[PDB]
Write a protein of this length. Structure first.
Length: 104
DNA sequence: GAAAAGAAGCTTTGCTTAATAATCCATATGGTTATAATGGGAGCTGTCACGGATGCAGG
């Protein structure tokens, strides 16, 4: 899960901003009060510190009240589900028959 | 519960078309012409009433 996140980010993160990053990429332009709501274990300035890291890294930014990742963090998520497909859903990553097509 | 049937999701593929090599052609530029060749032309012609600025002149 966050193994693929922090591993896919080359360990630039910790688990707090990992699951917060799952929350931000999970619903587009959500409020940080919902982030603190689904993270009751973390403090208000702990969540705001982790958003200070993602803003500090420039991944998650605002749109007025908006909160969303950029495309590079999106590539980190898609690599995370890629390795999650390599190790957790192996037959989901498959391929069917391919047409040639035409023969002389 | 089977079985045709139609979509999701891959591919090709004949056609197009935009990028780019090739070529040719307008265009500029300059040169170069060795007998001699010596002051233009429409100007309107039938306003006109005022008016102010020159303009000239004698006391």
């Amino acid at each position: 899960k966050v193994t693929y996140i922090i591993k896919a980010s080359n360990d630039v993160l910790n688990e707090k901003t990992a699951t917060i990053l799952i929350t931000i990429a999970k619903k587009d332009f959500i409020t940080a009060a919902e982030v603190r709501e689904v993270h009751p274990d973390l403090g208000n300035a702990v969540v705001n510190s982790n958003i200070g890291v993602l803003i500090k890294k420039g991944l998650v930014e605002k749109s007025g009240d908006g909160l969303i990742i950029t495309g590079e963090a999106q590539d980190i998520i898609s690599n995370a589900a890629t390795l999650y497909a390599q190790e957790n859903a192996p037959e989901l990553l498959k391929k069917r028959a391919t047409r040639k097509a035409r023969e002389i």
